[PDB]
Design a binder for this molecule. Structure first.
Ligand SMILES: CCCCCCCC/C=C/CCCCCCCC(=O)O
Ligand SMILES: CCCCCCCC/C=C\CCCCCCCC(=O)O
Lengths: 185, 184
């Protein structure tokens, strides 16, 4: 099994546990290049559901592609605070993360202050990254059972995130407006 | 009939308020909602964020949207915005009850109720901070020297109407932005 070179240094009971996972990952459309560049491979057949497709871009690439100001965009990228960033040409931004930052420009175009917009992003990124860890453990509790293998987790993880994701979007959307309805007074 | 609605305000602030109240009454707002809401500045903006002025009880919500009352009441407490704790008090906005009823859907996938409620709490924490900063961001743009109370109202109705369609997707996109991050 030449896939013996995606297993690396893993031995014992864990090498068989990994081999079965790589078996299922490869047969999902996942390529050897992604598996090698991701330890643990676990979340590979799952990360596509939250918008991550392994495609990376640079701030300048985002700036030209989506027709946005580079300076303001990179301010918003510091505000979300996700990738070690400060070079317009570092291809280190997830394609979807890049498109998400390009929308901030639109709020500034509606007369809202670019200093304030960047601040709102900062507060949101702070609040959502705390809910993120509450979300991580909630799902992990739901998919970790007796003595499940790597594959068991990857299969359970893919199944659960698939059902959950269509709900999360309109959920948090409903949540934000609930706060907007009660901060109003 | 406006004279009652002006309250104790006099002089300059009264004539301003007078014009604002004549506007709000045309916009469908009842004298009750104006009395109960002081300042009444943003009553013409509330319907742009989901507030249709109609209220429901936890009983109405639980049966209609078909969700468990106990979980519903827990979720409403985690949001920490309406604290009347009794089943049949008609004190919840219709839009909020709809939003709180979404909790049940997550539980019925095998997710733990205690953690579902916890995540609700941690979200309402972040969004309340965020909404506060949003209000000050909005207020800055809608506001400039010597603008009447009516001026701020018509302008905030114009500005908020433009921002709303982008906010939903924005908060949605910002959620997945952080979710992708956990996974790597
Ligand atoms: C990348 C995210 C960019 C952040 C953009 C900032 C969002 C703009 C905020 C929304 C304003 C609408 C809220 C209405 C509050 C009304 C203020 C008032 O009380 O008079
Ligand atoms: C009003 C009720 C609110 C319901 C809160 C939703 C509960 C969130 C639970 C799980 C969704 C998060 C999905 C991502 C978790 C990480 C999984 C993983 O990558 O291993």
């Amino acid at each position: 099994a030449n896939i013996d070179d995606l297993l690396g240094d893993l031995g014992g009971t864990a090498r068989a546990e990994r081999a079965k996972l790589v078996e299922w990952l490869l047969e999902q459309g996942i390529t050897p290049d992604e598996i090698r560049a991701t330890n643990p491979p676990l979340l590979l057949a799952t990360r596509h559901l939250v918008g991550d497709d392994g495609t990376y871009v640079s701030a300048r690439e985002i700036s030209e592609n989506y027709g946005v100001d580079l300076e303001l965009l990179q301010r918003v990228q510091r505000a979300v605070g996700l990738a070690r960033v400060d070079d317009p040409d570092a291809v280190v931004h997830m394609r979807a993360d890049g498109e998400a930052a390009a929308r901030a420009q639109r709020f500034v175009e509606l007369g809202l202050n670019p200093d304030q917009v960047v601040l709102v992003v900062r507060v949101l990124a702070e609040g959502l990254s705390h809910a993120a860890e509450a979300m991580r453990y909630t799902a992990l509790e739901a998919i970790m059972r007796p003595g499940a293998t790597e594959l068991d987790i990857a299969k359970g993880s893919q199944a659960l995130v698939s059902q959950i994701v269509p709900l999360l979007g309109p959920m948090i959307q409903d949540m934000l407006f609930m706060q907007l309805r009660h901060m109003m007074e």
